[PDB]
Every structure is written in structure tokens, then in C-alpha cells.
Amino acid sequence: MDVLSKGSLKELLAHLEKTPLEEAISYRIGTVPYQNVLISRNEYYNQLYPDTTSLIDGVSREGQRNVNGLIMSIISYVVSGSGHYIPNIGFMLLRRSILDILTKHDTGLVTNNLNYGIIARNLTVSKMNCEQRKRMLICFKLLAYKDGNQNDYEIYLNQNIPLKQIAPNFIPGDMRTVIHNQDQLAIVGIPAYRLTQSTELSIRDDNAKSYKLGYVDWYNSNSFLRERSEFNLIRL
């Protein structure tokens, strides 16, 4: 909820600094992705409604323990609000924040030898919207600049013209580009008037709608409940 509410590059990067990797990953096994399933949408049809499970559905799915699984889990958290199930990551990586995993060399993780085309295919980039596409490219650029693979990032953008049009305009090493950036990246937010409490056809659309509807209640009643648990505890 908090990650999807951020609407600026500054706010998104600030949030990733304060958020440990534990929030990105999940401890629920979920189901295997890329499965043609029939779900129930009784609002519209009596028959079952076909759909395909993906990594950006907003529901935890099983993921491998390699470097790609950890990166895919982080990107899913940014664009869908929920991560995947990577078994036994270890306390050493869980305490580190998301940005250090993306943009630092002290994590002990070798993020080189990463193919952005393969990762984009696995995350179903063809199904995500402009804001989700923009957030995914931000993670790619941070990973590319840390490992000195700026050429491979440019090659990926050249092959994908639609992604090149909406590419973020910041440079990871320069602070001036971050402050002057005018991108809008807010998936959820408090809307003028309201939105009907009705279901949607797709798994992604319905889960995204559930986040928007619950944001208003989460905004008002989160400070006290979080503080009660935060008090008398040490942060990871």
C-alpha cells in the first residue's frame, strides 16, 4: 500500500531506502505462475472466467532462490504491492534495504550476468500499464548503472520502442536528475468523489482495485496500529 502510493521518483527512492528486503518477499507458498485457470466472476457471467496467473498479480507465487528470483520479487513488490516466495534467503540479506540490493556492492550479491529481456518476459511487461512499466525501468537502470552495464540497458530500450518512449529521465549517480524529475508513478491514491465497490474481470485489475479501495481506510487507521508494534522494538 505504501509503495504503490508513492507518486514521485524522490518518494519512491526514499521509501526503498527505509524498507528492508523482508517486506519485498513473502512467506506464503502461493501457486505456480503461468497457468491457464478459470476463476469465478459472478458479477458478470454465470460461466467461469479464463485468466492466466502471472508474477505481477499481487499474490505471492513460488520463485527460485537464484539472483533472478530475488530481483523479480523486488520488481513485483514495486509494481504489484506483493512479492514472491524465495525459500531461506538468510538474515544477512533480509536486513538490507531494497535500494542497497539494487544499487550497492556490499550486499554480497552478484547481480551481473542479468538479462533484462528474460526478466521482462517473466514479469509480463506486455500486461503492465504505464506506471508499472516506468517503475520496472527504474529498477533496471539502477541495476545496470551499479554493475557498469549502461550499454545493455540502452540495447534493451532500443529493441523495445514502446518502453523507450516512456523511459525515466534520471541518471542513477546524479542527484540533480532525481530532484527535477516530473514522473508520476502513483498506482493508488485518494480519489476525488469515490469508486464503486465492484469487482473486475482480470486478476490484476481486481487485485489493483482492492488496493485502491482499501487505501483510504489504510491512510486513516495505520499510524496507531503500526506504532503499537513499533514501540519497544529495534529496526532490522
Binding site: 500500500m1 506464503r28 502461493g30 501457486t31 497457468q35 485457470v37 476463476i39 469465478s40 466472476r41 459472478n42 458479477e43 496467473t53 498479480d57 499481487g58 499474490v59 505471492s60 507465487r61 504491492g81 506483493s82 464503486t196 465497490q197 465492484s198 469487482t199 486478476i203 481486481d206 487485485n207 482492492s210 488496493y211 479501495l213 482499501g214
Partner: protein, 50 residues
């Protein structure tokens, strides 16, 4: 319709609507999908934790 509207509003977070079948809203959708998930592992997990 006063007793039904109060119960449906609590159940569905929405009042009953004219020219629109009342199915139970998001609560009905979540309940129907978790029932499917309970039956078999092959059934997907669709409802988010939020």
C-alpha cells in the same frame, strides 16, 4: 427493504442497487475463490492478503 439493506450493506460494503443483480460484492468474490482453492492444489490462489 430496511432489514435487508442494512444486512447487505454490512456484508457487501455497498447498498443493494436497482437494475443490477445483487451477488454479494467483493465478499462473495473472495469467498467463492477461496472455496475453489481449498479443493485442490491445481486451483489458483487469486485473492490477495490485503
Amino acid at each position: 427493504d430496511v432489514p435487508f439493506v442494512q444486512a447487505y450493506s454490512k456484508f457487501a460494503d455497498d447498498n443493494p442497487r436497482h437494475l443490477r443483480v445483487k451477488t454479494g460484492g467483493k465478499m462473495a468474490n473472495a469467498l467463492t475463490n477461496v472455496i475453489r482453492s481449498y479443493y485442490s492444489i491445481n486451483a489458483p490462489a487469486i485473492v490477495p492478503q490485503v
